[PDB]
Amino acid sequence: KEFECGSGECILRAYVCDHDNDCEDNSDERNCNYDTCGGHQFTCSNGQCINQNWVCDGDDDCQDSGDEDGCESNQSHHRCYPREWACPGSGRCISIDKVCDGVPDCPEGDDENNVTSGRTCGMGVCSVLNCEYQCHQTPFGGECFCPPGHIINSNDSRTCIDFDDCQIWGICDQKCENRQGRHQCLCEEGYILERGQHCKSSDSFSAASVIFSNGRDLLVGDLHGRNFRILAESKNRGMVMGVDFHYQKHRVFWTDPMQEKVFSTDINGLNTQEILNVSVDTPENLAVDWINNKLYLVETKVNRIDVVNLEGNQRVTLITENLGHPRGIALDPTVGYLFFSDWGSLSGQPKVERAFMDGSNRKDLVTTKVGWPAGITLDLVSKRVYWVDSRYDYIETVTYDGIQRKTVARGGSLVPHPFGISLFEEHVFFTDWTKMAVMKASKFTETNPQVYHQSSLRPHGVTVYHALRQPNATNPCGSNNGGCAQVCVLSHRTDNGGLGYRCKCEFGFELDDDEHRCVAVKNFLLFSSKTAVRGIPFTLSTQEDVMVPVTGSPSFFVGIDFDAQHSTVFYSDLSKDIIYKQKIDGTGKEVITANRLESVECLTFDWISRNLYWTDGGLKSVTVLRLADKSRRQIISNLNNPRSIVVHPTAGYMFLSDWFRPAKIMRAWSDGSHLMPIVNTSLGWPNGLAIDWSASRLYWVDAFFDKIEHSTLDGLDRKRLGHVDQMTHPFGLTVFKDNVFITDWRLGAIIRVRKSDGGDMTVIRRGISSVMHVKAYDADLQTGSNYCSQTTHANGDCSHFCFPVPNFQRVCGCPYGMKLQRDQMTCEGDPAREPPTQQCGSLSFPCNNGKCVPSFFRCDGVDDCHDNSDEHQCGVFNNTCSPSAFACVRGGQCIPGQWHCDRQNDCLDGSDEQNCPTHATSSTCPSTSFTCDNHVCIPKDWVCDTDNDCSDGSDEKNCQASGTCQPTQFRCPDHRCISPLYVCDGDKDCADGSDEAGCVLNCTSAQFKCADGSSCINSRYRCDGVYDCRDNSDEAGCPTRPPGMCHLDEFQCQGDGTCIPNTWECDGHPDCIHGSDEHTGCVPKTCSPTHFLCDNGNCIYKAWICDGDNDCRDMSDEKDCPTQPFHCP
Amino acid sequence: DTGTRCNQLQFTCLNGHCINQDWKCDNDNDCGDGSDELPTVCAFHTCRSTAFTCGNGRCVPYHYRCDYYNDCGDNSDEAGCLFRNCNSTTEFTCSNGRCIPLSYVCNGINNCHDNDTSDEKNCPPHTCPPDFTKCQTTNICVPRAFLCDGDNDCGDGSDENPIYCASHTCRSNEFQCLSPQRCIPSYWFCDGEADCADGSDEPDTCGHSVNTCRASQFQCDNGRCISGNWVCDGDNDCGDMSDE
Amino acid sequence: XNXXX
Ligand SMILES: *[C@@H]1O[C@H](CO)[C@@H](O[C@@H]2O[C@H](CO)[C@@H](O[C@@H]3O[C@H](CO)[C@@H](O)[C@H](O)[C@@H]3O)[C@H](O)[C@H]2NC(C)=O)[C@H](O)[C@H]1NC(C)=O
Ligand SMILES: *[C@@H]1O[C@H](CO)[C@@H](O)[C@H](O)[C@H]1NC(C)=O
Ligand SMILES: *[C@@H]1O[C@H](CO)[C@@H](O)[C@H](O)[C@H]1NC(C)=O
Ligand SMILES: *[C@@H]1O[C@H](CO)[C@@H](O)[C@H](O)[C@H]1NC(C)=O
Ligand SMILES: *[C@@H]1O[C@H](CO)[C@@H](O)[C@H](O)[C@H]1NC(C)=O
Ligand SMILES: *[C@@H]1O[C@H](CO)[C@@H](O)[C@H](O)[C@H]1NC(C)=O
Ligand SMILES: *[C@H]1O[C@H](CO)[C@H](O)[C@H](O)[C@H]1NC(C)=O
Ligand SMILES: *[C@H]1O[C@H](CO)[C@H](O)[C@H](O)[C@H]1NC(C)=O
Ligand SMILES: *[C@H]1O[C@H](CO)[C@H](O)[C@H](O)[C@H]1NC(C)=O
Ligand SMILES: *[C@H]1O[C@H](CO)[C@H](O)[C@H](O)[C@H]1NC(C)=O
Ligand SMILES: *[C@H]1O[C@H](CO)[C@H](O)[C@H](O)[C@H]1NC(C)=O
Ligand SMILES: *[C@H]1O[C@H](CO)[C@H](O)[C@H](O)[C@H]1NC(C)=O
Ligand SMILES: *[C@H]1O[C@H](CO)[C@H](O)[C@H](O)[C@H]1NC(C)=O
Ligand SMILES: [Ca+2]
Ligand SMILES: [Ca+2]
Ligand SMILES: [Ca+2]
Ligand SMILES: [Ca+2]
Ligand SMILES: [Ca+2]
Ligand SMILES: [Ca+2]
Ligand SMILES: [Ca+2]
Ligand SMILES: [Ca+2]
Ligand SMILES: [Ca+2]
Ligand SMILES: [Ca+2]
Ligand SMILES: [Ca+2]
C-alpha cells in the first residue's frame, strides 16, 4: 500500500528514503535503511547512491550538484583563491604578491604597468578602502586581502568572511582538515609530516628508487639522479617498453615489444625468467596486483587486456570490447578498481575508462578534451588518477569518480609528448618522447620541468620502486582460491554480494551454471583475419574471446578448421605458406605441412577418418593429407580458381567452388573421383560454402549477385535467401543452429542472419581488418562413425588412406608414388609411374623444415625458413654469407646488411659498429626543408609542432612559448604551431578544435558530399550499397531496377526473372535456368586455321595443343590427345 | 543359347540366368550351380573398391567384417577383429567371440551360430512332439516344413538330410515338391496355395483330372479341393463358389 | 576482383 505522507498524498513506497522530499514533510527520510552503495554507484552529498554513468553527464542528479563539481578544466578561473588575484585580461589566477612586482607575469601583462590602456602601477584608492588586514595596489585599483581562513568579500571589497582554505588545490600533501585552528594538514600512517605542509615517507621503509626504461634497457636510480645503474639490458635487439614492480616479492617486470616477450627479475639484477611469449606480440604497458599476486597486461596487435599470474600461467582475458588503441593501465587493489586509457576506440571517441578489477562495470571516466591519453597512475592515499596526453599535451588529474578535473601542466613547451607517468610523495615522474628525458614535476601545479635523466632514445614507462607505493590490504581470494575452480580475480570490494571477487575460467573452459566450476567449452564462433585467428562466443553479451588469439610477426591467415577431439585448431598462413596446428589454450604449435604450398585458400577436416583437405590457388588443385601419417596426394588437379572446400564425412561427399568465368560448384566422393558439377547456372564468384548438419543442406554465397543460396547435396531444390542490406562482397559463411554467420569484405565485418529467410542482419563484429573466413566450432558436430572408424577395425582396414563414399561404404587410397595392391586394400611401391622427387629443386636451399627458399637467402641474417635452418652455422670457410649481409670478422657469425653501422652492436666481436664512416659529406637537404642534427630532412612546417620528427629532437629544441611561429603555420591557443595541412581536416588537432572551427566542406569535384554536410566521401562509394554517410544520403536517389524488369544493360532470364549482364548474353554458356541467354538468335564464334578454340575457352595457337598446359582452361586440348612421347630423350 | 541376352550389369550364368555382378565370386552359389564361383572366373577378377577381399580372393560386402558370421570362408572377415569384453556373469562367450545372456543357451536354436554350435550343446527337458522334430543331438525342435527341403535349418540336425528323405522322398505321411526339394504334409497338398515353387503341390490335375482331387475331397470348378464338411457351409472353401 | 591477396 502507498505511504500516507503528512500532506495526505498516497505516496508509492519506492521513494522511501530515496534522498528526495516526495512531499512537504520529508517523513520518508525520517529513518533510512540505505547501504554503503555499490562500486558501480556514486555517493552524493546527502548519502544518495546514484548510477556511476550519471556522474558528469551534464545533469545535476544530486542535490547541490555534487555529481558535477567542475568536470571541465581550464575554466575562466573566476573566484580565485584567497592570497591569489585574477588577471583581468587573461583570466589567470596568480599570487597576490606578484602584482606590480616588476614582472609581467600574466601573458597580457595584467599584473604590471602599461600606459596604452591607463593601467600603470600607481596607488589610488587603498587609503580610503582601509582593508581590515592589508590593502595592496594593483594596476586596476586598490584591493584587500585577509589572513588564512577567510575570503575577501566582493560585496564591499572591505570585509572578509570565513572560508575553508583547506579546499584549495595544493594546500597540503595528502588529506587536510579544518577541525581546530582553521586549516590543519595531516599525513597518512606510514608517512611523517615535514616542513609543516609536506608528507614524507618514514625511514622505516627503506629508501625509494625509480625504475624507468632508457628506451633500449631498463634502468634504476635514486630519487635525485646521482647514480644510475643498468638493472637489465635487452638482448636480441629488444627494447624495454613497460615497467612494473612487486615490492614484497622483490620483483621487477617489463615488456619487450620488439622481442614480443615479457620478463621478470629481482632488483639485484639476477634470476631472470621469460614469463610470456605466446600471442603477446606488442605489449604496451603493465600493472601488477600486489594484493592477489597477479599481472595485468595490455596487448595491441589484438586489442585486449589480460591477467596472468606472476609465473605466467592461467592466462584469462578480461576486456576485449571496443578498445581500439589501449595504451595505459593502473590498479588500486585496495579499493578494487582498474583504470585504463585508449587514444581511440573502434568508434571515433578517445576516452579514459574505469572498471572493476575484473572488467564488468566499465565506465567512461573522462571523455571531453581528451586527445591521446598515453599513461595512467594513481595517488593511492588521495584517491586520484593522473594521466597524460600526447596531442593536447597536458597532464591532468581527476578523482576516482572523475569529478574534480585539474591540470598540473599544460603547453607544448613544457610537456610536448608524454608517454609514461608515476608519482611519489610530492612529485610526479613522467617521460617524454620529444624532450627525450624522464621529467620530475610537482603533483599540484607545475610551470617548469626538470630533466631527471636525459636519454638519447625515446623513454618509456616509469614507476617508483617503494613500499608505500603498494599499501597493504587483505586478500579476499587468500584462501581456497575463493572457491573458484581455476582462477580467482578480484572485483570491486562491494561486488559479488560483498565477497569482492569473481571466478573466471582459463581459455579452454568456461564457467558452470552454478558458478565456481569450469567445464570445457562446447562451441564458439571461430574467425580468421590478416592479423589474428580468434574465437568468440555466439552469445553477443559475452564479447570476450575464448581462445588465445593466434598471431605472427608476418601473418595473413586465410583458411581455418578445428579438431574437437584434441581441442586443436588448424590454420593456414598466406605469408609463411605453412599450415599449423594449435590448441585452444595456445600450447603445441606444430607445422602440419610446409612443402609445396602456393596459396592455400581453405581447409576442412574429415574428422572421422582424420584427413585434412586444402585448396591451392597457385597449383590449381586440392590436396588431402592424413594426420596419423603424413600421407598426401592431389586428388583433384586442374581447377581454375578454386576456393572454400567442405567435406561431409558421413555422406562421403566433398564440395568445392570455382569462381572462374564459367563459375560452378562441384561435388565428388571423398576419394576425389566422380567430380561433377551440381550448380553452374546463375553463379558469380561463389566464395563461401557450408553444410547445414541439421538438415544436410548445402549453403553458398555469391559476390557478383551478392546473394545467399542453399540446396540439397545433389543440387536439387535451389532456393535463395532474402535480401541482406549492406551485403556487397561476402567471402566466408557458416551455419549454426538457426543463424547464418557471414564474413564480408566491403564492411570488413561479421554479420548474422536467420537461416530460414533473409532475417534480421545483426552485426557481431566490425572493423576487424581484412577478415577472411569463419567456422562454427562445436564439440558435438564433430562426432559420429562410419566404416573408416569402426571398433574391431583399424582405420577401415586400409593401409594409409581410407575415404568415405556415398551410401555408407569405404574406399581406400594411398599417397603419391604408391599404387593400390591387387587386393584393393594395401599399397605397393610405384616408382615407374610416380617416381620420387626431392623436397624442392635446384636454385633453392631445402630447409630442414618442409619449406625451401632461394639459395640467395641462405646465410643472410634473416630467418626465412621459419625454423632457422637457412642461418645454421654460417661464416665457415665454405658456407659463406650472402653479399647482402655483413659478416663479422671472426667467429662464423653474420648479420643483415642494414644492421651494419646502425648504432647498435650486433656482431659478437663488436665489428658491427667499428670504423664506421660517421661523418657526412658537404651535402644539405633541399632549401625549402629543414636539416636536423643527424641530417634528417623534414618539411619546415613540422618544426616546433610538439611531435618529434627528426627522431633526435632537433626540430623541437629552442621551442619557447614566446607566441611566435612560422608564417605558414597555424597557431593554436597556447598549445602549438600546426602545419597548414592539418587545419580544416575534420579532426581537432588543437586543444580546443580551433583548427577545425568554421571551415567549409569543399569536396574536390571527385567526392560525393553527404546531404547534411557532415563529410565528403569518395565517388566510388556513391550508391554501392553501403551507407558511407551519417545521414544515409550516400544511398539515396540511386538508380533502381524497374519493377519486375531488369536494368538497361542486364539481360533477363525468361525462366525465373533474374538478371544477368549483357556481356553474358550469347556467350556460349547457358547462364539462365533454362538457357534463355543462349537462344538461337546468335552464332558461335570461329577461329583462324593457325589457332584452335575449345568448348568455352578463348582461342589459342594450334602449336600448343596436347602440350600439357591448360591453355583453354577447359582441358579439352589435352584430353582429345594424350599422344605420349613414350621414347627416350 | 535360348534367344535372350542379359543386361550389361548382370553376370550371365552358364545355366542362362542373369545375376548382378556384385554377386560374382562372393563365396555364394547365386546362379544355382556354382558357375559364378568357378576358379576359372575368380582367378581373373578383383573385388570392387567398396568391398572387402577375403584371403582366398572372394569378395564380401564390408559390413560382413567382424559380424559374428564367418562368410569369407577362411574366417578372414573375422580374423584380426578386436571384440569387446564379454560379461561372464551376464553373457556366455560363444566360440566365435559372441556373447549373449545364458537364457538363450539350450533354448532351441544355435544363437551363437558358431561352427561347433557351442551354444546348442542342447540341454533341454526333451520329449519334443513328433511334429516339432528333434534334429538329432543338435536338438532343434522345429516344424517339419523345414526338413527334406534342401536348405539348412538345423545345422547338422535332421533338416533336409536324406536320412528320412530316403524312405518315401520325405516322411511316410508327407509329399515332396521334386523341384526345388521341399516337403509338405497331406493337408497342405492341394490346399489351394502353391507351396512348391514348381506348382507340384497344386498340379495341373489334382487327382486323375483337373478337379478330381481325392476320394474324400469335393471337386471345385477352378480345380481346388475341399473336405466333405466344407461343402455348402456358408464360407469360401473352393474359392470360386463351387461349394456355395 | 575476388583476389585474396
Ligand atoms: C606491508 O606488510 C608487510 C608485511 O610483511 C610489511 O613488511 C614488514 O614490515 C615490518 C615493519 O616495517 C618489517 O620489520 C622491520 O624489518 C626491518 C628490515 O628487515 C628490520 O631491520 C626491523 O628490525 C623490523 O623487523 C618487516 O621486515 C617487513 N617484512 C617483510 C616480509 O617485508 C610492510 O612494511 C607493510 N607495508 C606497508 C606500506 O604497510
Ligand atoms: C553579499 O551580498 C549578497 C546579496 O546581498 C548576500 O546574499 C551575501 O550573503 C553577502 N555575502 C557577504 C559575505 O557579505
Ligand atoms: C616460450 O616460453 C616457454 C616457457 O617459458 C619456453 O619453454 C619456450 O622455449 C619459449 N619459446 C616458445 C616460443 O615457445
Ligand atoms: C573550393 O573548391 C572550388 C572548386 O569547386 C575551388 O575553385 C575553390 O578555390 C575552393 N575554395 C573555396 C573555399 O571556394
Ligand atoms: C555385468 O552386467 C551387470 C548388469 O547389471 C553389471 O551390473 C555388471 O557390472 C557387469 N559386470 C561387469 C564386471 O562389468
Ligand atoms: C570349426 O572351427 C574350429 C576352430 O577354428 C576348427 O578347428 C574346425 O576345423 C572348424 N570346423 C569346421 C567344419 O569349420
Ligand atoms: C557496502 O558495505 C557495507 C558494509 O560492509 C555492506 O557490505 C553493503 O552491502 C555494501 N554495499 C553494497 C552495495 O554491497
Ligand atoms: C659462399 O658460400 C655461400 C653458401 O651459401 C654462397 O654460395 C656464397 O655465394 C659463397 N660466396 C660467394 C662469393 O659466392
Ligand atoms: C644543399 O643541398 C640541397 C639539396 O639536397 C640544396 O641544393 C641546397 O641548396 C644545398 N645547400 C648548400 C648550402 O649546399
Ligand atoms: C613571431 O615573432 C618573432 C619575434 O618578433 C618573429 O617576428 C617571427 O618572425 C614571428 N613569426 C610569425 C609567423 O609571427
Ligand atoms: C527503381 O525503384 C525505386 C524504388 O525502389 C523507384 O521506383 C525508382 O523510380 C525506380 N527507378 C526507375 C528508373 O524506374
Ligand atoms: C570463323 O568463321 C566464321 C564463319 O563460320 C566467320 O567467317 C568468322 O569471321 C571466322 N572468324 C575467324 C577468326 O576465323
Ligand atoms: C579388378 O576388378 C574391379 C571390378 O571389376 C575393377 O575392374 C578393377 O579395376 C580391377 N583391377 C585391375 C587391376 O584391373
Ligand atoms: Ca524520499
Ligand atoms: Ca551530472
Ligand atoms: Ca607584477
Ligand atoms: Ca558485390
Ligand atoms: Ca636467410
Ligand atoms: Ca648493428
Ligand atoms: Ca616536429
Ligand atoms: Ca604533442
Ligand atoms: Ca585538424
Ligand atoms: Ca555507399
Ligand atoms: Ca550466357
Ligand SMILES: [Ca+2]
Ligand atoms: Ca594444350
Ligand SMILES: [Ca+2]
Ligand atoms: Ca556368387
Ligand SMILES: [Ca+2]
Ligand atoms: Ca562375416
Ligand SMILES: [Ca+2]
Ligand atoms: Ca541357443
Ligand SMILES: [Ca+2]
Ligand atoms: Ca532344412
Ligand SMILES: [Ca+2]
Ligand atoms: Ca499346397
Ligand SMILES: [Ca+2]
Ligand atoms: Ca464351403
